[PDB]
Symmetry: D3
Subunit: 282 residues, 6 copies
């Protein structure tokens, strides 16, 4: 009886209800983006909900690789340290993370210090294609969405060298399914930091050449497409803020490229989580 | 091998924090789809959202728990995919009412295409004056539709058509702030209005219709993510939707969605409650 | 072999309906203890009731979900076993308050007996005038204690001492009828009173303190079974209790529990709600 | 309303009645698992019925009968157990009982939920089963063996079972020796036959030809069920005297007191899976 | 009948044989999960069959065929996998195999269960499927791809699948290079075709047009099954020579041990889910 | 590469060897649950050892020892079961055995894992335990009662157990009568004592003062372990003769098949939880 009548609502759905079906799917209600057992976020900015989704992602990687208490883990391209902190907190392990970014490693040590875990969390500026660690120093390791900045043959061989025999390396890598055009290969360099993904058979030829066995692979491509959407929406809606922080040239490059890059990702690539084992004894 | 380590190092120094501004406290994907979920047919935003909708529907079915051979009233049934899934999964008959001829036509087409026109009935009817008798339905649900209705009439109507002891599942929004007058109007201009009630106000209505309250569970994040998915689809497909629904309609969406997203985040909450019509001992 | 088939048949011919009147639509045991629960140490009603209490505590910890290194306020902490189990299971510090000197002393000795006096602090304080300062605790819970206090004051005082973004678990009763004056008095003479408010009234209080509502789940059948266990122990051990608490107290319970049981069944509900103090920005 | 100091003196003097009656905490027990449904009402009889249905769900789940099989309910009662098994697993259930009332009330169930070609309820003796050898796939005697001769009934259940099928048994057993007033209380309150000893019971199970595959103690469930039964009789003495007669109620009251102590201290109650071997 | 200072003597001398054979403990292995049912007997072939059925269940759960769909069983054997899938998911299953004896046994099995309308079994070659383009919703090749040209079989599976359907594949792959005697053993013992390599196999998968959604190693199940098979042949040489001829059995006896070592040290066995893309 | 026609004729002749050895299907058995980790190698000893550890994890889960308790391992072997229990549950374990070598290997294990303060391994007899009355909160006898006088062992375990504590027992029991040659094979192959009967065993359990809280058949697990053991002895006759002597190995090769049949046809093996009643 309030500001709308039934005939107004039915006429509205007669004219426009198909916009909900074109955007949300074969029904006209919410999607269950957060599982029921998940907790209610602190706030509801798109960044916070995305952040909780990231933590659940990290929980799933921990669960998959299954590091055991008292083991030492290597975070290949550790970003700003949250993944390692959660893995160490949950499994009671030591974690050493490497990254080529100074500010990133500083924020990761700041993080370890804020939680009183500088004795079990070690963050250093190192190249994954030339690790500064001995042979067989780590029980397990993971390359979470980092291999696309590196030579995969060098990074995988180096990870094989620093792993104890019988240990596992969890990999989160992308793969092309169709042949990319040259403009698409350039968007990899200009938008993010480059290296087009290899092919599926090509990627596992490199994994075999590094001396790894393959124990599992699981497609998570939808998760990459939703995250790339969350990103593109945040950039579109906050152009002024991001231009005042990162510049016009950078932001304008994202606005002009994110569309074509999303279509490329949707139609031509796949993203997966693979478990690689260094064989025991040889 | 298109870049070197130092190039990548410099890039994440200058820009790496843009991922922290958009994606969260880490720099990787979110687990938007649970691990046991099937891979979608497409990676289009609509197809991914559609699978999230169906998992949403699986959850509501699980929560209300209709038993085989029961009759369920779908208050504001849309185009009937919720009713179809509930019918296939539990072996129930479902009657859905909506005020849109087009939606009811689509829901009847759906029941015919799936050969279930004897277990799925879809009628054009008002929930605030349901034509059905008294104590006709074992359970019912109003999935995101009370916001179009006067909730006191619709909940009393739902109570009357429910057999004593059955349950009505409700997916309703509620204000936490006061709402400015421009914010109240956006409900009417963007969607089809009725500003959400207050918590105590809503449950005074729930009691006034004679319902007990069995459960309530917040789902505000699913609504904020869904509204996000909607806003992204409108933003990126403006040309297509203007050619389909007219410039005036899409322009209004482009003009209001940001402010409506802000109001939803900061002033409302969205929940799934189970109301019970008390049984006579 | 002290019965024949004819005798057992004639017995159920004459009397089987007493089982159906007492135990339900079946003539066998109830699954009162889930299959994965351990076999109790004995079979006294009190110990079987206590194991159900611990599983009750286990479920509250699972629902509130306190994380390691946090500080939890127990509003009406009793003798502190709830605080102890939460502390042992989650690696948290717990500060419990109560207005009874005997309970706080027993709670402090429970912390000393388990060697946890440094993580468990029990003090004699009022929940409507908490002595702790603003934003002191990460989370809190009031387990069946709000019926002794002014709910508006206790909740506002719980809101003040919580850190923004923390959660308060509440186990509260609510009326569904109006309550006669003899019943409202029975609250005072049997327990320690305060008739329960109404659903919308309670949530107007919860909103008025500043809380958002995230979950509600009905646990009325649990409170009814607990109350039934309580009444059976009083009926079965009148002589024991009159020698310990005095004839006046026990007789008052004997005279009131039947009427209180009916009032609880037909006029009240009992739920567990999760209230959040809002967050930053 | 009340003041704080009133509440403080109250628990200072009466708080321990809760620990004497409810346990080492001062709150509710989780008597109903969180995933269970909110009952239609809060009456002791209705809540107790829901726990009976959860009990029945669990037995079906334990025995795990398969679709298209035929199950024997030895001592079917009024047949709600047999009904829930038939709806949930798509099986046929034949129930027997020595009571014309309970078989009548069970046919009252086979009628409505339109089955009759699946369900079945007959007045028969378990120690004298009328059925043909090797006719069933599974069976169960749910709290019923205490009215019969366990040796005859179990041998009779073995004969009617196909080789390879399973017999679920919900039986009680003594852990002490039992005095004569206790053994008589078994006959005057219920319908008698004192429980055997554990090794004794399984010598019988072996003698009928059964292998043992499982055993699980449910004695806390029987103690709670008997506490609920006691509370109902205590609170409704006038109602049950107006129905069953004063003789019944008076004997119940006296026996119930000095029977709960014997059940708690001298008996155990369990669910056992017995198998008829299949070479 | 024995004493302590006699059992300890025994373990002082031989306890190491328990560790050499069974592992780092001296007790049983949990070979059957605690929720599995007791087998009908304890013969090795039965316990292995129950594991085979639980294996089938896992494949059903993995591919997840939905009610009303049509499933192609590429290399269906004698059809028990097709039977369970049809009964459990309400689907239609068409299975092909190049063995006339197996297909006869599979249609015989379908007739005995009354499912000849939902179970079709034909003699055909998976490298030359006679079926129409986009005829099946889903498909699976259970341990059959080692008898085929995997490029011809996967492209032909890709053609007969509807766009968006899934193909479950159970395949082996080498991790070392293999000597010539080992490659020969593949042909003489079983029906041959040495497994490809990992990137080589997925070059084939991508070339047929399949996207790869999952891969899961099951190599221990294959090695444990190969041992159960070898122990069966070792134990019943006389029985198997009387039915399959001395030439066949002596070949298995002379090659099983070396083939086991090749399997252990040079090959891995996985379940993988391949999707035909939908546009 | 081999062709189709050849594969067809191959299964036409040799197909049924799989249904005779592997079961009603022609594929792998799910010997390892899907959530189990991939073993380090594929040797039969390593896969069996992983099965042994999941077995231990199950016994731990079943007895459910709580942090800070003291467990008595009766017949503790070389200590890995005690180590896993101490690591997972944060408990102290005391294990006894009559074998000096085994105890030395367990004290070795405690030292290497730095758990000598929580792990104690001593040479003692379960039928004459040296510990005081009511010393341990729980205990378990994992496949070791077969070496002892079960009456003496159980009553002894009862004495050292605190009231209310539990004893996990993994015992076998005869279902047939056993010929005298089979009884002798118990003594010569292992270290003897024929198993008791089901009612006999529980007359002892009750004679020792224990209540029975559970029983679960695990016969398939023991039977498969005995097959794993037999295959290993068969396949490594040369290595084991060079290690333990020809006399011992020839005895195993002569008796293992007969013992296998006896175990399959005449005995069952189960896990039972016994409780010392509380006061
Ligand atoms: C959180 C999502 C952000 C937005 C940020 C974090 C990760 C970075 C910058 C590498 C992301 C961007 C680009 C990304 C990926 C990836 C995960 N997240 C990716 C997969 C990546 C693995 O190496 N490979 C690819 O090719 C993709 C894409 C073009 C298919 N890519 C270059
Ligand atoms: C699928 C999401 C779409 C986008 C479309 C389908 C549903 C419609 C049009 C009602 C949606 C829009 C507005 C919506 C909601 C709702 C769910 N979905 C909502 C909750 C609604 C329940 O009554 N209440 C509200 O106030 C909200 C919002 C402003 C908080 N609202 C008016
Ligand atoms: C363990 C059950 C004992 C018996 C004891 C522990 C708790 C006390 C004394 C407060 C109990 C008594 C009265 C109780 C409740 C309650 C839980 N347990 C209650 C719910 C309470 C929450 O505030 N509200 C009510 O109104 C109820 C009832 C009349 C509906 N009440 C006054
Ligand atoms: C629902 C509980 C009611 C109250 C009613 C239903 C069952 C009947 C009447 C047999 C019950 C009464 C007596 C009962 C049992 C039993 C279950 N329920 C029992 C176990 C029974 C199994 O044969 N054995 C016994 O000895 C017990 C008891 C004295 C240990 N008994 C005689
Ligand atoms: C039940 C196990 C039996 C013994 C029988 C059933 C299957 C047959 C005859 C193909 C088997 C034999 C050989 C087998 C396999 C296989 C599964 N079972 C295999 C995996 C196969 C998949 O293509 N690939 C291989 O290479 C293997 C092996 C040498 C690694 N192989 C040729
Ligand atoms: C693990 C496998 C090994 C092979 C070795 C470890 C355990 C030993 C030697 C006791 C084993 C052998 C004989 C064994 C058992 C047993 C478990 N493992 C048994 C059950 C035992 C329990 O008391 N009882 C029996 O009689 C059996 C059998 C003949 C039925 N037995 C003498
Ligand atoms: N060659 C290289 N050696 C080491 N780290 C590298 C690298 N190239 C890129 N990286 C690092 O890999 C990271 C990829 S972003 C992923 C961050 C982190 N794995 C997370 O999940 O949050 C960046 O932090 C970048 O600094
Ligand atoms: N007064 C009223 N009476 C009955 N239905 C109404 C109504 N006002 C709005 N509706 C219907 O409620 C629906 C809300 S959109 C939700 C659609 C559906 N519940 C789904 O889950 O997909 C629309 O179909 C609209 O037609
Ligand atoms: N000798 C006998 N033969 C067959 N049934 C008997 C019997 N003696 C008693 N019974 C039946 O066993 C039942 C025990 S009461 C248990 C009822 C039912 N199994 C339930 O769970 O609800 C009674 O209904 C009684 O009629
Ligand atoms: N005004 C008040 N402020 C703080 N605590 C109070 C109070 N009024 C009553 N209480 C306490 O609240 C408790 C309720 S009984 C609940 C005990 C405990 N929470 C448990 O879970 O077992 C009593 O112990 C009483 O001492
Ligand atoms: N080229 C080919 N085309 C079709 N089927 C083939 C084939 N080569 C072998 N096969 C079949 O593949 C089967 C391999 S044994 C696997 C049997 C079945 N998948 C099961 O799970 O039991 C054999 O039955 C054989 O008949
Ligand atoms: N009389 C006795 N007293 C104590 N231990 C005995 C014994 N007789 C045999 N044992 C021990 O019981 C063990 C049986 S082998 C079982 C090993 C261990 N329990 C495990 O689970 O792996 C041997 O270590 C043997 O030394």
């Amino acid at each position: 009886q309030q500001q709308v009548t039934a005939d107004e609502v039915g006429d509205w759905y007669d004219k426009f209800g198909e916009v909900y079906h074109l955007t949300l799917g074969e029904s006209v209600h919410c999607g269950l983006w957060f599982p029921p057992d998940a907790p209610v976020p602190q706030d509801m900015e798109l960044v916070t909900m995305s952040s909780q989704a990231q933590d659940r992602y990290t929980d799933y990687l921990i669960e998959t690789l299954d590091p055991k208490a008292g083991q030492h883990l290597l975070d290949i391209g550790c970003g700003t340290g949250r993944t390692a902190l959660k893995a160490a907190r949950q499994r009671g392990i030591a974690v050493t993370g490497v990254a080529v970014s100074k500010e990133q490693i500083a924020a990761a040590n700041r993080l370890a210090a804020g939680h009183g875990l500088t004795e079990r969390l070690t963050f250093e500026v190192a190249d994954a294609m030339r690790l500064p660690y001995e042979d067989e120093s780590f029980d397990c390791a993971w390359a979470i969405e980092s291999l696309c900045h590196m030579d995969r043959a060098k990074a995988l061989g180096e990870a094989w060298r620093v792993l104890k025999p019988g240990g596992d390396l969890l990999v989160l890598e992308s793969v092309v399914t169709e042949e990319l055009t040259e403009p698409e290969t350039a968007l990899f360099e200009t938008l993010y930091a480059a290296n087009v993904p290899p092919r599926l058979g090509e990627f596992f030829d490199i994994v075999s050449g590094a001396g790894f066995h393959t124990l599992s692979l699981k497609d998570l491509s939808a998760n990459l497409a939703m995250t790339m959407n969350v990103f593109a929406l945040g950039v579109y809606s906050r152009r002024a803020e991001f231009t005042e922080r990162f510049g016009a040239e950078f932001v304008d490059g994202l606005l002009a490229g994110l569309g074509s890059a999303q279509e490329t990702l949707i139609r031509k690539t796949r993203f997966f989580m693979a478990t690689l084992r260094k064989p025991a004894v040889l």
